[PDB]
Each structure stands twice: as C-alpha cells, then as structure tokens.
From a paper:
In this work, we unraveled the intricate mechanism leading to the release of AFs Ltv1 and Rio2 from pre-40S particles, which is coordinated by the r-protein [name]. Two β-strands in [name] connected by an unstructured loop dive deeply into the (pre-)40S subunit, almost reaching to the Rio2-binding site. Strikingly, ATP hydrolysis was substantially reduced in the [name]Δloop mutant, revealing that the [name] loop plays a crucial role in activating the Rio2 ATPase. To determine three-dimensional (3D) structures of pre-40S particles from [name]Δloop mutant cells, purified via [name] as bait, we used cryo-EM and single particle analysis.
The structures of the C1-S20Δloop and C2-S20Δloop particles could be solved at an average of 3.47 and 3.79 Å, respectively. The main differences are within the head and at the bottom of the platform region. In the beak region, we were able to partly fit the solvent-exposed domain of [name] close to its mature position; however, the cryo-EM maps harbored no clear density for the two β-strands that deeply dive into the pre-40S head. This suggests that [name] is not yet fully accommodated and stabilized in its mature position. Strikingly, we observed a density detached from the head in the vicinity of rRNA helix h34, in which we could unambiguously rigid-body fit the X-ray structure of Rps3 in this rotated conformation. While the Rps3 C-domain protrudes from the pre-40S structure, the Rps3 N-domain is bound to this pre-40S particle but in a different orientation than in mature 40S subunits. Enp1 was also more flexible than in other structures, but we could nevertheless rigid-body fit its central part (aa 252–390, compared to aa 205–465 resolved in wild-type pre-40S particles) next to rRNA helix h34. Under the platform region on the 60S interface, C1-S20Δloop particles harbor protruding densities; focused classification of this region allowed us to unambiguously fit the alpha-helical C-terminal moiety of Dim1 (amino acids 136–318) into these densities.
Residue numbers in the entry:
A (entry chain V): 1 to 87
B (entry chain W): 2 to 130
C (entry chain C): 34 to 250
D (entry chain A): 2 to 207
E (entry chain X): 2 to 97
F (entry chain R): 2 to 126
RNA sequence: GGGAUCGAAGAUGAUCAGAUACCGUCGUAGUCUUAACCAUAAACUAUGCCGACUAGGGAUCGGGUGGUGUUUUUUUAAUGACCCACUCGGCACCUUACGAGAAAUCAAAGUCUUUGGGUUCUGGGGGGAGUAUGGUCGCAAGGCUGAAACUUAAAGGAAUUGAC
C-alpha cells in the first residue's frame, strides 16, 4: 500500500507461509520459521548462510509440515528420492 | 439432483483453498466454467489448469496458487443494468479497490470493470476476490 | 531499574531492536510488558469498565473488582486486558498490564483514492466473541466513527478515523463486544489483497543475528 | 545442494539393518506412507532406510543451523531414550531433558524450569506429546523420531525409525550425533568412523 | 438452500409467504382488522371527554402498598364506562 | 508422643553425616562430643541432640540410613561409562559376519544399490 | 367366532400406621381372530428431502475382485469357513477441530456478515387457549381447521458454583 506520492504507508509487510502461501500474522505462535544450513565442500555448515522456510500454524497444526517441508527441500535440492509428486 | 455446476465447482475450489491445497478435480465441466476460470486466470487468482476428456463431459484439474481469498456464485442469475453494478459491487466486494463481480453479457462473460469499459451489461454469475 | 528474564527482553534492553515491527514481523510471543512500555512510549491507556463482583471464597463473601482496560496508541497499536482483583486499583493496574501484553497492530487503509495518509480501514473485517459479531466497513474521509461509545473508544485508541460498524447478538455484555471488535481489528492483518501478492524473501530473526548477545550466562 | 560425500555408507547401512530400524509399525498413518518400503506378510512394514538416512542428514543440517549449541534441547520420557538423550547431549553440547517433562518449561518466564530453546528434538511424539504441545506455543521447531503410527501433529522434519527396539533408538541418536559433529568441524574427516561405539547410547540395567 | 425458494420466477410464493406470516405481528393484526375502531374505549383517538360517575379508592397491595385515587367516568361519545387515574391531587379537590 | 523437634533431628543428622566415625553407641561420650564439636548454648538441648545422635548411631550401624555421603554420585557418573561392550549387537561378528534379514528388506537394500552381506531368511504371515 | 392368561369398570374382605397409600381375592368389557370404522403418540433420531465438497481410525453386515494364504484332504482339485489386501452399499462406534454453536455438543447441527446448489412445511414474549364460533370428516368417541376480548415483565434454554 502506498500514497499518491508513491511512498509506502504500511507498518510492516507480513511474512507469508511457504506451504500454503498465506499470511503468517503477528501472533501466529504455532507457526515456525526453519533454517537449513548451507554446507561446505567438506560437509561443514556455513555459519551465517541459511536457506529459510515458513510453515504456518495451520500447516503445522494440521499435521502436514513434515511432508510439505520434504517437498520444499527436495524441490530446492536438499532431499532426493523422498517426496514423490505422484501418489 | 445436481442442478448447478459452477456452484459445485467454486464450492470445491473454495474448500480446497480453505484447507490450503494446491489442486482440485472438478466433475463435470462446462463452457461457462472454462470462461469463468479464464477470467480468474487473467487477473491471476489461479495459475494454470487443465481439461480432461472422457467423451461425456470433461473433468478439470486446477492448480491454485495461494491468492484466492473467496469465490462464489450468485445462484439466481439476476438481471442487472449499468448502475445496478454499483449496487452489487457495494454488496459483495471487500473494498472499492479490488475484487471482481463477474457478469454474463451478450459480449461474453467477464468482470464488471471490463463491462464498465465496454459499456455493456447482462446477467450476473458470481464474485471473486 | 528493570532486569529482564527473557532473551527477547534483554534484546530490547540492549537497544538491538528499535520497533515492534520486528516482533510483529516474526510472530513472537511477548511475555514482558516492559518491552511494550519501552517501545510504545506514547501508549495511552483508558479504562472501559470497573465493576464489583461478589465472590464466595471458602465460606467468605467478598468483593473483588473486574477491570476491563484498553491500551492504545494514536497510531495503529491496540491492546485489550481484563483482570479480576481484590482491590479496585490493583485490578486497574493489572488490567493495564494484560492489555500491554495483548497489543496487536492494525492495517488502516483507504476508501477510494490514494491521497495523504490512510484514514479508514483497508477491507471489510469481522470479529466474533460470544454471540457478539462486529463488522467493520470502510468509510469516506471525515465521516467519523459510527460505533457505540465503548467500541468507538477502542477504535479511537487505534487511530482509526473513519469506519462504519454493524453488530449482531446481545451487545449488552460489553466484554464480548470489545473482544469481538478486538478480533475484528486484529483480522485486518489477516486478509490477503492483490497489492500484497508480491513474493518476499524470508528475513532472519533477531534471535540469530544477535544470538551471541542476549544469551543467559 | 549436497555433495556425494553425504551419501549412504555401507557400514552405516549394516548398522541400521542390524538395529531393526527397517522393521516398521503394524498400522501406518496417512502422512507417513511415503516412508514405507513394503509390508511383510506378517503385517510389519518396511522403512526406506535411505529416506531415513537423508532425513537424518537434513535434521543434522537443521541442528547445525542453530548458532549457540545450548538452545538445542533433546527430550525423552522413553526409558531407553533417557540414556540416548543424555549421552547425545554429552557428546553434542545440547541440553537434555530426560524423564518427566515439567509443563510450563517453555512458557512461565518466572520459574526455575524456564528454558528458552530454539529447537526441540523428540524421541517419541506420543510419549513426549506434551513437549510437542508446549513447543507449539512459543515458536519452536520440532524434530521427532516417528515410528510408522506416530502422530504427526505440530512436527517438522520427522525420522522414520522403530521406537520399540532400544538398539534402533540408541543408533538413531548415535548417527544423528555423529553427523552433527561431522557437520560442525570437530570431526574434520568424513572417512573417519565415529570412534565411540553405539553401545554408549544403548540402555542398560544391572 | 435456507428453506425458502430462490428461483427467478418465484416472486409469487415469496409474497404470499410474507402476507401469511405478517399476521403473526402485533401491530399489523390490530391495524388491519380495525381493532381500535371497534372495541377500544376511545375508538381510536388521542383524547376523550366524559362525565364523572364515581370517585374510587383503588388499592395497590404488593409490593407497593398505596391508595390509588381513581375516577369512574361514562364517556360522552360512546356511552362507555371507563375508570381512570387522576394525578397529583391527594384531596381530588379539583374534582367532584 | 516424644517427637524430636526439628533442631535436634537436623543437628544430630548433620553431626552423623559429616562426623560419623567419632560418634559412638554410648550417650556419655557422644554427649562430650556434642559439647566439644558444636556450640550448643544449653545443656538440655545438647542432651537432646546427643541422645538423638546416640539413637541414630544405633540405627546406622545396622544399615545405611538416608543421610549425606558424597561418595556414590561419582560412581554413578562412572557407571555411565563402565558397561561399554567391545562387541556390539550391531557388530556382524555376533551373527557370523552376515545380516540375517527378510526378502523384502533385501529388496530394499537392492533398491538402495548398496552391497552388504545379507542372508535371506524368508517369513510368511 | 373365540374366550386359557391377565385385566379399565364392578362385586368385595379390609386394616395400621400417619411407612406412603393401603392392599388382597374374584372378576364384565377388552386382550385373540373375521367384516368393517377411527387416524391419534415423547408416531423422537425431539434433527425435512434431493445433490456436491471437506479429517483420521478400527470393528462389523450384504456383494464382488485378487492370494504359488490357511485348514478340513477325497490323490490332486473344487466346495465351504477363516486370515490378508482392495472396492462398493449400509447400521453403528471413537477421536479430535480445521470449522460451527449460547452451551451441552456436531463429520454434520461444517463449507453463514467473506451472508445465494434446488425445493416443501413451520414459528414471532407468556397466558387466556388448541378454548369460543363456523366449516368439514365420523354411528359414536373424537380428528382436522382455528380466534378475539381480556391479562402480564417475564416465561424460558444451557452451563456454573457451594451456603438449612
């Protein structure tokens, strides 16, 4: 949201979920933010560089956050041969 | 028995969006449904979707992104005139800023802002926001 | 001098978080009202109701006091707190505290055009508590707050300038009404609009950038 | 985003077959039939131990993502998991909670049981159910060691194993412990097996 | 679908349903039957005149014990006997 | 009902937990011990403490009563590291170098594409 | 027509306490059929009917498809009967809550202020009153339909505590 001067007029842009793309609100405490560590060639974690995920309280509460995070990881190349798109 | 088909279609779309899913299977299909989903797809409340033939009346598989809040039908298809649009957009939309009451005019089925621009009217099917 | 006990609190004491928009951005549970007091210095409370309730506690007929208190910025940060206590002023103070804890932001927007500051809300919203349902509708500029004076005061403690309201249910019981209006103004940051379809990258928390600080020693 | 260094080891696969980690539960829930390989004719399902291995790999990545190693908490009310969790946290740097979980340990900022994790790891989501429900209020990720009929409410990355056999539990904690330490940098070479035996994490009684 | 017809050629059923269900109101049934024009003592007017026949010491017992000061009147327009209260005069000294 | 007060119980218990071997079965020497080893202002309450030391010393020479002795917690710390068997049940030498496993689990390992020593013992229902 | 049991009425012996009313024995009608009449129930699942979608789980009932399953071995089979896996179509159960509701509770009493799948019927504070009158159906008993005058600030539904 902006004004007629083209400058933004909001308090904060909300975080959206990643499994269902819905808004993670300012008091969803059943939601979860996940960091997965970027690895080295030796298999050491880079300390300050992560890949992040957002799994909302509806997603996590329904009992789906495992499968959905498997999907997101294998689609981002962190898993392989786990999440099958056909069932 | 099964009397309206666009109503059942938007019922299933809305239920699967409420559960947060990604795809739906609509049975049966119609020309009206295809045009409606094209109107949705033009502004992009959905991604791509796909017809399936079985020689009877097709099925549809819809990929739905995350953007749909709610869609629905107005089941008695009311006759509307031009200023009458300003009634229904005052009733169904969540703001004056967005949302699309969709009409069935003689020049095709489309959202209300295009019928403002094309300066036509007709009947009404449903609402998307 | 206030000592924290939570690692959010000693982040706030360290001057490492500036606004609550980080906390609102990261869906964090707050448990220290001193955070709210240090980050909302222009936070102005107002009592809504003080009422004596007669308890029957272990053969003792006694008088306690239910205090329904609203805190609220003149910008969009609202809080509701209901507290029963043995004393009037203790009920006032702890209701203030509970309202400090349950502060939620609001998304006040436009009606029609895009000029100046947002004055009305951005969409329609609805809250429910008990049988009380409160429906908020945007209003044109300078139209005031068409609401009952409890609800009107909870909206004036939000910086909401223009809104139409309609309720349903037994709105006599004013705490259900204030809770339903509070849910309605909390759900405004809960309805996804096409101007927020833009995909954004997930930023990191202050919990890990400042992880070496703010740890329990 | 993974080298072929991370792939499944023949030694580790012999370990996992010896511990009966592949022997899944009798009844399988809806959300974990991806992890099933097949059902034996006696009614026991088979767990894809390669999927299990790569789930441990991703869990070890997540454990590596927490900067200060103290906010990682391991949890067990399971008897064998008490031993496993204690020796895990000994070799790890994480903090253990063996035995009975005190409610209000993650809420209640006043009491002495008040801890502020950034990750919770669970042996049995049915035996440690209240720890899952407690973590569901203060925004904590949950790693669980789920058998094939374990409930998957409020869980993140869940590892398919057998929570019945103590060898399976101790070995799962063992492999997760060593893989985390290899990811840290205290176990610089990957060719090196972890020198402490998996018998230190198995449960004993005189 | 909410137990009522929604077909686009069904205005008749809706308005017959309303004309049947408006007899369950109070003001409608008094109003369209000519109730006030037949049995109400004023005959549907805001005031009336009459001739005092009696002064009455009516009694209100519970929970308020008071001696109500009333007057039995016969109205001029109808020939209708109506009792009525008279306020503020403990003596009824303005009334005979 | 001669219930000992809290001071006599706690003082006598502490004098036996810290200072066990000096104390004896006899009241008259434990009385002089309580005279010399604790600053008890009154003879009477000293006699209370000393006779309760005498009674608890009669009780502890029959068996270990639940006092304080910091000589066993370190042994329990050692007990964690004592029973580390040199051949695990995971070690193949327990089963002659081979993994005795079923047909479907062998099918799993074949699907993994990893070569292990396996003996296929079939089961049925 | 039948009439054995029990038994609205009735005919009767009562009595002893204020332990309540008593009770007990005989017993016509009826209870059972045939030919007709009547059309009412807490005729309740207190939940109209048709149709779609939305979580699991394990039992059953009817049908069907598989099994180098099992057993009765008749020599192998084939029957059957169980076990396993799947599929329809039921009567029920048990969790939760995503959602609903005032709550008890509800996989529908959900997809409802973000209010529209189709359609039938019903209600508008409590009494007066299912009363009065009229019509209609019936031999009768009654059923259906169905008021007003007048009177009144509550009558209610669910849940919660402890004081005779």
């Amino acid at each position: 949201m902006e004004n007629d001067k083209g400058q933004l007029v909001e308090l904060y842009v909300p975080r959206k979920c990643s499994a269902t793309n819905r808004i993670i609100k300012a008091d969803d405490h059943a939601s979860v933010q996940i960091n997965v560590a970027k690895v080295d060639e030796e298999g050491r974690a880079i300390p300050g560089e992560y890949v992040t995920y957002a799994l909302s309280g509806y997603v996590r509460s329904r009992g789906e956050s495992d499968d959905s995070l498997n999907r997101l990881a294998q689609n981002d190349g962190l898993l392989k041969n786990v999440w099958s798109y056909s069932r | 028995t099964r009397s309206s088909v666009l109503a059942d279609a938007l019922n299933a779309i809305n239920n699967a969006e409420k559960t947060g899913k990604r795809q739906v299977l609509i049975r049966p299909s119609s020309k009206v449904i295809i045009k409606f989903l094209q109107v949705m797809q033009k502004h992009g409340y959905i991604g791509e979707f796909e017809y399936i033939d079985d020689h009877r009346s097709g099925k549809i598989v819809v990929q739905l992104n995350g953007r749909l809040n709610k869609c629905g039908v107005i089941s008695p298809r009311f006759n509307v005139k031009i200023g009458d649009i300003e009634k229904w957009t005052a009733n169904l939309l969540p703001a004056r800023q967005f949302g699309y009451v969709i009409l069935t005019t003689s020049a095709g089925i489309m959202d209300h802002e295009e019928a403002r621009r094309k300066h036509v009217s007709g009947k009404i099917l449903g609402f998307v926001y | 001098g206030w000592v924290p006990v939570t690692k959010l609190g000693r982040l706030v004491k360290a001057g490492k978080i500036t606004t609550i928009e980080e906390i609102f951005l990261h869906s964090l549970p707050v448990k220290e009202f001193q955070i709210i007091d240090t980050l909302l210095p222009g936070l102005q409370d107002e009592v809504m109701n003080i009422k004596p309730v007669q308890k029957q506690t272990r053969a003792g007929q006694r008088t306690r006091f239910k205090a329904v208190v609203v805190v609220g910025d003149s910008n969009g940060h609202v809080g509701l707190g209901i507290k029963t206590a043995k004393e009037v002023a203790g009920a006032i103070r702890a209701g203030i505290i509970i309202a400090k804890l349950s502060v939620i932001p609001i998304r006040r927007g436009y009606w029609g055009t895009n000029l100046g500051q947002p004055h009305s809300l951005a969409t329609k919203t609805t809250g429910k508590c008990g049988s009380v349902t409160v429906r908020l509708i945007p209003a044109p500029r300078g139209s005031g707050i068409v609401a009952s004076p409890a609800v009107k005061k909870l909206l004036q403690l939000a910086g909401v300038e223009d809104v139409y309201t309609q309720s349903n249910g037994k709105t006599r019981t004013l705490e259900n009404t204030l809770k339903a209006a509070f849910v309605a103004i909390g759900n405004t940051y809960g309805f996804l609009t096409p101007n927020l379809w833009a995909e954004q990258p997930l930023p990191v928390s202050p919990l890990d950038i400042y992880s070496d600080e703010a740890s329990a020693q | 985003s993974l080298p072929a260094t991370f792939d499944l080891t023949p030694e580790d696969a012999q370990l996992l077959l010896a511990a009966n980690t592949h022997l899944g539960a009798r009844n399988v829930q809806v959300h974990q039939e991806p992890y099933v390989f097949n059902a034996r004719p006696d009614g026991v399902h088979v767990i894809n131990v390669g999927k299990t291995w790569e789930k441990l790999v991703l869990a070890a990545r997540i454990i590596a993502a927490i900067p200060n190693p103290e906010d990682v908490v391991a949890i067990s009310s399971r008897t064998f998991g008490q031993r496993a969790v204690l020796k895990f946290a000994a070799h790890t740097g994480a903090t253990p909670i063996a035995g009975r979980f005190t409610p209000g340990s993650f809420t209640n900022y006043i009491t002495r049981s008040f801890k502020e994790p950034r990750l919770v790891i669970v042996t049995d989501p049915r035996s440690d159910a209240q720890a899952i429900k407690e973590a569901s209020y203060v925004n904590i990720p949950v790693i669980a060691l789920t058998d094939l009929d374990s409930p998957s409410e409020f869980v993140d990355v869940a590892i398919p194993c057998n929570n019945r056999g103590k060898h399976s539990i101790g070995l799962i904690w063992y492999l997760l412990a060593r893989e985390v330490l290899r990811l840290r940098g205290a176990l610089v070479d990957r060719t090196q097996p972890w020198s402490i035996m998996p018998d230190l994490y198995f449960y004993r009684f005189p | 679908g909410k137990g009522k017809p929604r077909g686009l050629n069904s205005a008749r059923k809706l308005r017959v349903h309303r004309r049947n269900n408006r007899w369950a109101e109070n003001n409608y049934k008094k109003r369209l039957l000519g109730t006030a024009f037949k049995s109400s003592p004023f005959g549907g007017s805001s005031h009336a005149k009459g001739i005092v026949l009696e002064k009455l010491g009516i009694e209100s017992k519970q929970p308020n014990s008071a001696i109500r000061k009333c007057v039995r009147v016969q109205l001029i327009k109808n020939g209708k006997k109506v009792t009525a209260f008279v306020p503020n005069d403990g003596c009824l000294n303005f009334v005979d | 009902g001669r219930v000992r007060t809290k001071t006599v119980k706690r003082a006598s218990k502490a004098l036996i937990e810290r200072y066990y071997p000096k104390l004896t079965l006899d009241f008259q020497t434990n009385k002089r011990l309580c005279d010399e080893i604790a600053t008890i202002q009154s003879k009477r309450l000293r006699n209370k403490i000393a006779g309760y030391t005498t009674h608890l010393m009669k009780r502890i020479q029959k068996g270990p009563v639940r006092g304080i002795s910091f000589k066993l917690q370190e042994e329990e710390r050692e007990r964690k590291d004592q029973y580390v068997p040199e051949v695990s049940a995971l070690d193949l030498s327990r089963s002659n170098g081979v993994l005795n496993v079923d047909n479907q689990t062998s099918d799993l390992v074949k699907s993994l594409g990893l070569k292990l020593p396996l003996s296929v013992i079939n089961v049925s229902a």
